[PDB]
Design a protein around this ligand. Sequence first.
Ligand SMILES: OC[C@@]1(O)OC[C@@H](O)[C@@H](O)[C@@H]1O
Ligand SMILES: OC[C@@]1(O)OC[C@@H](O)[C@@H](O)[C@@H]1O
Ligand SMILES: OC[C@@]1(O)OC[C@@H](O)[C@@H](O)[C@@H]1O
Ligand SMILES: OC[C@@]1(O)OC[C@@H](O)[C@@H](O)[C@@H]1O
Ligand SMILES: OC[C@@]1(O)OC[C@@H](O)[C@@H](O)[C@@H]1O
Ligand SMILES: OC[C@@]1(O)OC[C@@H](O)[C@@H](O)[C@@H]1O
Lengths: 90, 90, 90
Amino acid sequence: SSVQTAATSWGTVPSIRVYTANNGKITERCWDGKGWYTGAFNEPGDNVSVTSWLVGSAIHIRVYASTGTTTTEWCWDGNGWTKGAYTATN
Amino acid sequence: SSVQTAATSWGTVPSIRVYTANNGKITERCWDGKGWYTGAFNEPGDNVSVTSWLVGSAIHIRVYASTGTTTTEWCWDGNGWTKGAYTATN
Amino acid sequence: SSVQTAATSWGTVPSIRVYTANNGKITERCWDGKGWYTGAFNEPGDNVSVTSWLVGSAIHIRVYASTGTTTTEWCWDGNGWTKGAYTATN
Ligand SMILES: OC[C@@]1(O)OC[C@@H](O)[C@@H](O)[C@@H]1O
Ligand SMILES: OC[C@@]1(O)OC[C@@H](O)[C@@H](O)[C@@H]1O
Ligand SMILES: OC[C@@]1(O)OC[C@@H](O)[C@@H](O)[C@@H]1O
Ligand SMILES: OC[C@@]1(O)OC[C@@H](O)[C@@H](O)[C@@H]1O
Ligand SMILES: OC[C@@]1(O)OC[C@@H](O)[C@@H](O)[C@@H]1O
Ligand SMILES: OC[C@@]1(O)OC[C@@H](O)[C@@H](O)[C@@H]1O
């Protein structure tokens, strides 16, 4: 079994995002103040970390998904997840 | 062996909380500016993540404790840890 | 294989730091707005978490590196990494 999670939040309501790596797949659960719901993030990986920041009221999220020794960065900037420029030499 | 940790902080002093999952138990160490001490958080799990936010000067902490594929959310809102509404279908 | 990561960010640009535990070594990749580059952090461990805070414009980072059941705190306060006072009894 053994899932692994990562979490981030922003604002005062707040918004919360919880990422779960489970059996090689990372998924996302969301709270915007009233009920948990499933987010759009779906990417492969066995390990996840996350950070986020606001620019004014606009949220930006970066999820670091790793499989084996390879880490891929995924970016939310308000209109869909895209692959980020992150590289590492592991 | 193999412990796994998660950390959060708030303010400028700052306050720091470090959660350690060890042998199926999650515990908490605290810094409020002058010496580390043991916190009230004690919950079962093999994996931990955490996030926190301020509303004014009031801290709110959410700890995501997982055992197997089951994640439980624990909430600090200034007066004791309580189970949160988080659910996931892992 | 299996790397494990932790991430923190600050500001609005933003600055991002991603820590990777790989084969007992923790290293750091950095973003300050224009290109990823390798950071100064190099410490042993199989597990990593991180938190950070600003005092004005001055960033402070705490990395919690664990090997076996032993966690060491590493501190960035603008002029080099130093060992922190964190202790735990795992
Ligand atoms: O409101 C939910 C949502 O749009 O929030 C921002 C990101 O977390 C997305 O993955 C997610 O679907
Ligand atoms: O806009 C996307 C991007 O530039 O955001 C900042 C960093 O996360 C980069 O790796 C990433 O490609
Ligand atoms: O001052 C310590 C404490 O009250 O801080 C808030 C939470 O981290 C609690 O678990 C913890 O006992
Ligand atoms: O006050 C508790 C609560 O509503 O806080 C926001 C989220 O963490 C919820 O899952 C949780 O039940
Ligand atoms: O600009 C990079 C750097 O100085 O940023 C602060 C810390 O992350 C250091 O380890 C790192 O080398
Ligand atoms: O200046 C270093 C220090 O005092 O910063 C706050 C905490 O991280 C302590 O463990 C650490 O020794």
